[PDB]
Amino acid sequence: HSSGRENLYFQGHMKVIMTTKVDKASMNIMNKLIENFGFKETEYVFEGNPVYKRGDVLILTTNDEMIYYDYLDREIENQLGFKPEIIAFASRHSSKQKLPALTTHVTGNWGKAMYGGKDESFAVAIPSAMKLSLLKMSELNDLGWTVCYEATHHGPTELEVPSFFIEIGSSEEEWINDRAGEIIAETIIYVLDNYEKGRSKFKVALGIGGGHYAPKQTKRALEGDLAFGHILPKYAQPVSRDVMIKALNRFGEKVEAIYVDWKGSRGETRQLAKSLAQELGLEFIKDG
Amino acid sequence: YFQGHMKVIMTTKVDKASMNIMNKLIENFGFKETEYVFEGNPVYKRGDVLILTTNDEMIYYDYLDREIENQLGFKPEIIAFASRHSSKQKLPALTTHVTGNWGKAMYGGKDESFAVAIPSAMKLSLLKMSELNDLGWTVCYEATHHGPTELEVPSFFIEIGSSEEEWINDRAGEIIAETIIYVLDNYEKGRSKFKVALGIGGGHYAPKQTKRALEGDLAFGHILPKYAQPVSRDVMIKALNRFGEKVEAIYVDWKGSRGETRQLAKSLAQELGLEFIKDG
Amino acid sequence: FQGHMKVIMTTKVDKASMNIMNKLIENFGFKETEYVFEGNPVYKRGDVLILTTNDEMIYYDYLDREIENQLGFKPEIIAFASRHSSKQKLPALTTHVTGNWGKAMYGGKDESFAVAIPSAMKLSLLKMSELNDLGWTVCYEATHHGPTELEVPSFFIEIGSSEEEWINDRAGEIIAETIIYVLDNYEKGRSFKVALGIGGGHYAPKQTKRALEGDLAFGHILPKYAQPVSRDVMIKALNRFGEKVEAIYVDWKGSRGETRQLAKSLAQELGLEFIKDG
Ligand SMILES: [Mg+2]
Ligand SMILES: [Mg+2]
Ligand SMILES: [Mg+2]
Numbered sequence: 001h002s003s004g005r006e007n008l009y010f011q012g013h014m015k016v017i018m019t020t021k022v023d024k025a026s027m028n029i030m031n032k033l034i035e036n037f038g039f040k041e042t043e044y045v046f047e048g049n050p051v052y053k054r055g056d057v058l059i060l061t062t063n064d065e066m067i068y069y070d071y072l073d074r075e076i077e078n079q080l081g082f083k084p085e086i087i088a089f090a091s092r093h094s095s096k097q098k099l100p101a102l103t104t105h106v107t108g109n110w111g112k113a114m115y116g117g118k119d120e121s122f123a124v125a126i127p128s129a130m131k132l133s134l135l136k137m138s139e140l141n142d143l144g145w146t147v148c149y150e151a152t153h154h155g156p157t158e159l160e161v162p163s164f165f166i167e168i169g170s171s172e173e174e175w176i177n178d179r180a181g182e183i184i185a186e187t188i189i190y191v192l193d194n195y196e197k198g199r200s201k202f203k204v205a206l207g208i209g210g211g212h213y214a215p216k217q218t219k220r221a222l223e224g225d226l227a228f229g230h231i232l233p234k235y236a237q238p239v240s241r242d243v244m245i246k247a248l249n250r251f252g253e254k255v256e257a258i259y260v261d262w263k264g265s266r267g268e269t270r271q272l273a274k275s276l277a278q279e280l281g282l283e284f285i286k287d288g
Numbered sequence: 289y290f291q292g293h294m295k296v297i298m299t300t301k302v303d304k305a306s307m308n309i310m311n312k313l314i315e316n317f318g319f320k321e322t323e324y325v326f327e328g329n330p331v332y333k334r335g336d337v338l339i340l341t342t343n344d345e346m347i348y349y350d351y352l353d354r355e356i357e358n359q360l361g362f363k364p365e366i367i368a369f370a371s372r373h374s375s376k377q378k379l380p381a382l383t384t385h386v387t388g389n390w391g392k393a394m395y396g397g398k399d400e401s402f403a404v405a406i407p408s409a410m411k412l413s414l415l416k417m418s419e420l421n422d423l424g425w426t427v428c429y430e431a432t433h434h435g436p437t438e439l440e441v442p443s444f445f446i447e448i449g450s451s452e453e454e455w456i457n458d459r460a461g462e463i464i465a466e467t468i469i470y471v472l473d474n475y476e477k478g479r480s481k482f483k484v485a486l487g488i489g490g491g492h493y494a495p496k497q498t499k500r501a502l503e504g505d506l507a508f509g510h511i512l513p514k515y516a517q518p519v520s521r522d523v524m525i526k527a528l529n530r531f532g533e534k535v536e537a538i539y540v541d542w543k544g545s546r547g548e549t550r551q552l553a554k555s556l557a558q559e560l561g562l563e564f565i566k567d568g
Numbered sequence: 569f570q571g572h573m574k575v576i577m578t579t580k581v582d583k584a585s586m587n588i589m590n591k592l593i594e595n596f597g598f599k600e601t602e603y604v605f606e607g608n609p610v611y612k613r614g615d616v617l618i619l620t621t622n623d624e625m626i627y628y629d630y631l632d633r634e635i636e637n638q639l640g641f642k643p644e645i646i647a648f649a650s651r652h653s654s655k656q657k658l659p660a661l662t663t664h665v666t667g668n669w670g671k672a673m674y675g676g677k678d679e680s681f682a683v684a685i686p687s688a689m690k691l692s693l694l695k696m697s698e699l700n701d702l703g704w705t706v707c708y709e710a711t712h713h714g715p716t717e718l719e720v721p722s723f724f725i726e727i728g729s730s731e732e733e734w735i736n737d738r739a740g741e742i743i744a745e746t747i748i749y750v751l752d753n754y755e756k757g758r759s760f761k762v763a764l765g766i767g768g769g770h771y772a773p774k775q776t777k778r779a780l781e782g783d784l785a786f787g788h789i790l791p792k793y794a795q796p797v798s799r800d801v802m803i804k805a806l807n808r809f810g811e812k813v814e815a816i817y818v819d820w821k822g823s824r825g826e827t828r829q830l831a832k833s834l835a836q837e838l839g840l841e842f843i844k845d846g
Contacts, residue, residue, distance in 0.1 A: 238344055238348060240348065241350075241398070266327075266343075266344075267327060267342075267349075267352075267355035267358070267359065268342075268344070268348060268349045268350070268351070268352070268355070271350065271351035271354050271355060272350065272351065274351075275350075275351060275438070376752075377596065377597075377748060377752060378614050378615070378616075378752045379596070379597045379613055379614055380614045381597055424612065424614075425599075425614070426597045426598065426599040426612075426613060426614075427599065428597060428599070449597075490594055490595075491594050491595035491596070492595070492597075493595075493596070493597040495593055495594060495597075495598070499600075543590075544594055
């Protein structure tokens with residue numbers, strides 16, 4: 001299709017759900033979206049795969065892991081002729097531990113990149129979408145699974161459009177669970193349909209401290225107004241002032257606070273956070 | 289528990305020289321293991337002297353004093369950082385210096401910022417390390433370099449250079465341990481004849497400043513080596529305002545300095561009513 | 569002074585030597601010691617010492633015996649920090665071994681050679697070139713001048729060719745940096761192919777080019793103006809390398825006919841590689 005036809009077909013804000021053939025959770029979620037939400041087939045292709053559409057929401061499918069797809073937004077523009085408003089990556093979470101979970105997080109590398117993207121670099125966070133994801137997954141969760149953030153981790157990082165990962169953890173048995181697929185599908189649709197308007201009461205925060213599943217950040221997001229973007233877990237601390245500043249500059253909604261799980265943070269890192277909050281005119285929120 | 293005026297020795301688990309020095313302090317002096325922890329590690333105590341240990345490099349621990357206050361409930365009188373020095377050159381050395389960044393910060397701290405220097409403690413360090421040195425190693429200052437800078441308690445680094453072979457040397461650890469205790473026991477009362485100076489010029493190991501500190505009354509705080517020159521008037525003033533003991537002189541290694549900087553130093557000394565001291 | 573001791577030799581009478589010594593002390597963490605050599609202070613940086621003599625160093629045959637007598641150790645290597653002086657202006661940073669192909673006019677004995685240290689000189693050439701922001705020539709010089717009566721391996725490292733260059737602060741720093749780097753590193757990274765060099769002018773242009781281009785590390789170098797020499801003299805020089813000789817290299821066009829044939833013959837006789845350049 002010509003750019004002309006693409007500019008008419010994909011006019012206004014387009015919201016992209018990214019999937020991949022190699023991820024059983026991703027394919028589960030895709031199946032549930034197609035089965036239940038009124039997606040249509042289109043004449044468009046992306047990475048040699050069909051593009052599905054439901055109003056302003058699209059499903060695109062790549063052929064390999066999504067975590068290495070730096071410059072994905074450049075390729076959506078090249079292949080389909082538009083810059084997405086948001087990318088929701090529908091994904092698995094893998095762990096050796098038997099944690100059944102429904103999670104959301106932004107991608108980025110506090111230090112060295114081992115699973116995609118660049119060192120000390122961050123994708124652009126979308127706090128409202130992640131907060132609504134936690135709230136809706138929590139409501140829909142009849143599985144007894146943990147609904148939580150994860151820390152900023154893995155790629156891609158070279159994305160200018162706001163994005164988030166939404167995931168089923170932590171093994172194949174959970175990835176292919178029909179109900180989990182349906183919960184995530186229902187969540188993605190609700191979030192994409194509501195995050196633009198529904199964010200007016202949220203307080204955007206960088207989160208610091210605690211483990212990979214960000215328990216205090218999660219509790220605050222479920223119970224109050226905080227909407228986290230990047231989250232710096234204890235295992236990733238300490239980081240330099242320049243790295244923290246970089247993360248603070250990689251939010252798709254203006255940062256208003258730096259939040260610290262105090263006992264869950266390194267001394268040097270919690271002091272740096274406090275000093276940067278003061279320096280940058282952000283609220284400092286100390287839990288503990 | 290930590291009532292009185294605590295002097296702190298800072299160590300880290302990631303630095304082999306630091307841990308060597310830590311163990312020699314504990315083995316050779318009357319430190320007890322307290323019931324208290326700092327950064328999750330034991331705190332040791334000998335009278336008014338404490339040993340604390342962090343888990344990562346110390347050079348990035350800006351606001352360390354705030355954390356000592358937070359975790360242990362006191363403001364330290366001084367911090368002595370027991371540290372390695374690292375170089376590719378085969379220089380075995382026992383050194384002391386203050387931290388700070390003449391320009392951009394690449395190894396901790398903030399750009400164009402300085403820790404608070406403690407000249408008396410560093411001069412006593414040089415003198416005592418020289419007296420104890422039976423290794424044939426070089427005892428000298430280093431220039432002001434690396435972090436942290438965001439500290440409002442006087443502090444100094446005391447270091448074993450320049451590779452693992454030196455860092456783990458038992459006698460080097462013993463010398464630095466013995467020096468730390470002597471310095472902490474004496475810097476307050478032993479400095480009445482010292483003349484506090486900003487030092488300018490020479491290379492990283494500040495040879496002329498070191499010679500003056502070993503032979504005469506001069507006690508240097510911040511030292512600005514030729515490789516870090518030139519600096520602005522405001523940067524030199526900033527360093528002058530980051531001494532824990534009143535500055536009395538600006539000392540210049542003349543041939544060891546850039547023209548614009550040695551002129552600036554001379555002018556500022558006259559402007560501020562400080563003694564100007566020139567070698568060369 | 570127990571250890572693998574390296575000596576940097578200087579002299580009060582040489583402005584380049586004093587410039588180099590100043591930069592070493594300014595920048596590399598030398599200490600003053602209690603020790604004296606030739607009545608002058610000894611400076612120390614780990615296993616590297618700076619010693620200073622009162623007169624020209626080129627006449628100091630048996631210098632290693634005196635280091636041993638005065639300081640009580642045998643040096644592993646001696647680096648002489650020196651000026652190069654020439655009537656023809658050529659700003660240069662150079663290295664060479666000492667020896668006399670014929671009559672001794674500037675120290676040492678006739679038809680006698682110091683023990684060469686090819687690895688140290690090749691590393692010197694490489695480092696000086698890396699650090700040369702002066703735009704000066706960087707090269708070997710021919711084997712020339714004294715001292716010759718030295719059993720410890722040694723090399724001269726020099727600033728040429730006049731006072732203008734000798735007092736150049738940047739030149740002093742380049743040489744100081746080079747000496748420190750070489751003394752700290754010369755025993756590591758070999759394999760180099762050790763060669764006797766034959767042919768060319770005083771500044772050994774073809775030998776220099778080869779030593780920068782590939783693996784050749786020259787020891788003694790016999791320039792055209794010093795040729796011809798006898799088979800016995802060539803053999804003497806060959807027996808004065810601190811690292812085993814593997815090749816005889818000849819700048820063909822830069823050599824006298826009788827000498828280049830001699831070298832070719834001797835290489836075959838000793839089972840050395842013969843390298844003909846041109
Ligand atoms: Mg993920
Ligand atoms: Mg240091
Ligand atoms: Mg010479």
